[PDB]
Structures are given as C-alpha cells and as structure tokens.
Amino acid sequence: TFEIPESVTMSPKQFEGYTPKKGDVTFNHASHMDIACQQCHHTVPDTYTIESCMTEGCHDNIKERTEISSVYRTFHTTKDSEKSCVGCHRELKRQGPSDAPLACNSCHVQ
Amino acid sequence: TFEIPESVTMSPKQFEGYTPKKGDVTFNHASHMDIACQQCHHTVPDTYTIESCMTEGCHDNIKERTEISSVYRTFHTTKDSEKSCVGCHRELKRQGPSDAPLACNSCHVQ
Numbered sequence: 025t026f027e028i029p030e031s032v033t034m035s036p037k038q039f040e041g042y043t044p045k046k047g048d049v050t051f052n053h054a055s056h057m058d059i060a061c062q063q064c065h066h067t068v069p070d071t072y073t074i075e076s077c078m079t080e081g082c083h084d085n086i087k088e089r090t091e092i093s094s095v096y097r098t099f100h101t102t103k104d105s106e107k108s109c110v111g112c113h114r115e116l117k118r119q120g121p122s123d124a125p126l127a128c129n130s131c132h133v134q
Numbered sequence: 135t136f137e138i139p140e141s142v143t144m145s146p147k148q149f150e151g152y153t154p155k156k157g158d159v160t161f162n163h164a165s166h167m168d169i170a171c172q173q174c175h176h177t178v179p180d181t182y183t184i185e186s187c188m189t190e191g192c193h194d195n196i197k198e199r200t201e202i203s204s205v206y207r208t209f210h211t212t213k214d215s216e217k218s219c220v221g222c223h224r225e226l227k228r229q230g231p232s233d234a235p236l237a238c239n240s241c242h243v244q
C-alpha cells in the first residue's frame with residue numbers, strides 16, 4: 025500500500041523563527057532510483073518508518089551550522105558521499121563526467 | 135509516515151481455489167535489513183509503491199509451476215540470487231558459512 029512521492033519540495037520555511045537565505049529545493053526520486061532506499065533514509069532500522077530528514081530530533085538544527093544536526097552541514101558536506109547531496113554529487117565527478125548539480129542555484133530554485 | 139512491517143506471514147491460502155501443500159512462511163525484514171529495499175521489491179520504479187509479491191498480475195500463478203508468474207518458481211528458483219528466497223540463501227553458502235535456511239520446514243512453519 026506504501027506510495028512513494030516522486031517529487032518532494034524541501035523547504036527552510038519549516039522553521040518559523042528563521043529567515044531563509046536560499047530558495048526551496050526540489051528532490052526527485054526518479055533520478056536517484058538506482059540508490060538503495062536505506063542509503064539515504066539511513067535511520068530506517070531505528071524507527072521502521074521513512075521520515076523527513078529535518079524531523080524533530082534529526083537534522084532540524086537551523087541556528088548552528090557545523091553540527092551534525094545542522095541543516096547546512098547535512099546537505100552540503102563533502103565529508104560524506106553516501107547521503108549528503110553535494111557530498112555525493114561531487115564524488116560522482118571523480119568517477120567520470122557527471123551532471124549531478126553542485127551550483128547553489130541548480131539545486132535551490134523556487 | 136511510511137511504516138514497515140517487521141514480520142510478515144506469507145500464505146498460499148490467499149488462493150481460494152487451491153489446497154496448500156506446505157505451511158505458511160514468516161518473513162522478517164530485520165534479518166534482511168542490509169539488502170537494498172528495491173532489490174527484493176524490484177517493481178518499485180514501475181508503480182512507485184511497495185506491494186505484495188503475490189499481487190494480481192505479478193507472481194500470483196498457483197496452477198502453473200515453471201512460469202515466472204508462478205508462486206513456486208519465484209521463491210525457490212536458484213536461477214536468481216538477488217530476490218529468490220532459496221536462490222539467495224544458496225548463494226550465501228558459496229560465499230562462506232551461512233545459516234540462511236534451505237530446508238523446506240525451516241521456512242514453512244506455522
């Protein structure tokens with residue numbers, strides 16, 4: 025019965041007491057379909073559910089930036105190539121010509 | 135919001151006009167958690183849902199046995215080591231000592 029959402033618009037406006045500096049990000053599963061679900065959704069064994077990365081207790085820290093709980097580190101770190109957006113996209117380029125976006129405005133759009 | 139069922143009791147009693155020869159099978163995700171979800175649930179790209187293997191149109195053929203749609207071939211074939219139950223369990227033994235069940239009554243229980 026479980027249905028997967030193809031497109032997902034990730035947003036910083038989720039955090040009430042904060043002012044977003046960049047635009048929203050649209051994530052598409054289709055282009056990432058070859059990667060194991062649990063590779064990105066790495067906490068499935070912990071809760072037996074698939075949930076937002078920015079859930080309370082996970083990567084919901086918007087005030088600090090260097091912390092593992094930080095929204096910034098999590099999606100832009102190159103120290104992780106499995107589940108970090110830019111982290112993986114950068115790693116693909118070392119493996120050969122890749123179009124996986126690195127430019128800020130190629131990810132942050134609307 | 136998506137919740138995964140740890141234990142799943144697969145049964146042949148689903149097919150009304152049929153008499154099961156073996157007992158039900160209990161599948162546990164915990165012991166299989168290291169395998170990519172889409173490896174077993176191989177039709178996710180097709181429907182963007184995770185559904186029963188024995189759904190109408192999939193592996194629901196109980197009358198024929200050699201067919202890809204056959205409940206028997208699907209779960210006991212050794213010609214596939216990715217998503218066939220005995221197929222993978224057998225392959226593990228070639229990779230080193232394994233306890234993944236091959237005996238009929240180690241899978242069919244209640």
Ligand code: HEM
Binds near residue numbers: 056
């Ligand atoms: C594998 C085919 C796979 C599944 C299954 C899956 C599910 C899934 C769901 C159900 C959502 C919505 C979760 C919710 O209830 O909020 C969701 C969202 C995102 N996913 Fe996913 N996902 C699968 C695979 C992948 C892969 C390989 C990645 C990483 C490249 C990935 C990532 C994400 C992201 C990011 C989201 C948005 C999360 C958010 O905070 O809004 N998924 N996925």
Ligand code: HEM
Binds near residue numbers: 065078083107108
């Ligand atoms: C959503 C698909 C999601 C992403 C993306 C994501 C990424 C991520 C990274 C980059 C790390 C850093 C690892 C490192 O520094 O090497 C990481 C680590 C942890 N995460 Fe995560 N994470 C996503 C989702 C979730 C969810 C829903 C939670 C909360 C249940 C969560 C938690 C954590 C924790 C804790 C860590 C560090 C310890 C660990 O278990 O690895 N993540 N995540």
Ligand code: HEM
Binds near residue numbers: 049064105107110112
């Ligand atoms: C992190 C949650 C994340 C986001 C966001 C993201 C976005 C993204 C975009 C915008 C594209 C372009 C196409 C599209 O919009 O669908 C794209 C493409 C690829 N990505 Fe990605 N991506 C995120 C995470 C990850 C992770 C962690 C990996 C690697 C394990 C990954 C990989 C890829 C690949 C492969 C592509 C295909 C591009 C191609 O050249 O065909 N992404 N991603």
Ligand code: HEM
Binds near residue numbers: 036037046095132
């Ligand atoms: C380019 C170096 C770049 C910048 C700068 C940038 C900024 C940024 C900020 C500050 C946030 C926090 C929220 C805000 O609006 O201020 C944020 C969050 C996310 N980003 Fe980003 N981002 C840049 C580049 C990229 C690239 C190339 C991707 C996609 C691979 C990407 C993805 C994300 C995601 C996902 C988030 C979290 C959800 C959100 O707040 O939109 N960023 N980024």
Ligand code: HEM
Binds near residue numbers: 061062175187
């Ligand atoms: C990866 C962490 C993963 C997810 C996600 C997943 C989901 C899932 C669901 C939601 C069900 C119930 C489906 C329904 O609505 O009927 C389910 C059932 C089974 N799964 Fe699964 N599953 C994940 C991973 C794995 C892996 C790696 C395997 C293969 C070893 C696997 C297999 C199965 C089987 C068999 C069932 C029962 C199907 C039936 O016909 O009743 N899952 N899974």
Ligand code: HEM
Binds near residue numbers: 176177185191211
């Ligand atoms: C449920 C998790 C499930 C299992 C288990 C499963 C196994 C399986 C095998 C062993 C094959 C044979 C491949 C070969 O001969 O090399 C196979 C092939 C197909 N399947 Fe399947 N399958 C499971 C689930 C599903 C579901 C829910 C459907 C129906 C949407 C489905 C369909 C098919 C089809 C069609 C094939 C052959 C062609 C192909 O796309 O690979 N399966 N499956």
Ligand code: HEM
Binds near residue numbers: 159160166217226241
């Ligand atoms: C096919 C849907 C399938 C079933 C059914 C199944 C059952 C099964 C059992 C009964 C065990 C024993 C433990 C338990 O009951 O949870 C077990 C263990 C392992 N399995 Fe399995 N298994 C099915 C499918 C698959 C597939 C397709 C693979 C390989 C890609 C696989 C692998 C394993 C592994 C690994 C174990 C761990 C045993 C160990 O020595 O620790 N199974 N499976």
Ligand code: HEM
Binds near residue numbers: 146156158209241
């Ligand atoms: C041992 C060689 C063995 C036999 C024999 C056996 C039989 C069998 C039949 C005939 C079915 C159809 C339904 C019925 O009750 O008659 C069936 C279906 C499944 N089996 Fe099986 N099975 C044997 C062994 C194994 C092993 C080792 C596993 C687990 C790795 C296994 C799994 C399954 C699954 C799953 C099904 C489908 C769901 C069901 O009908 O119970 N079998 N098997």
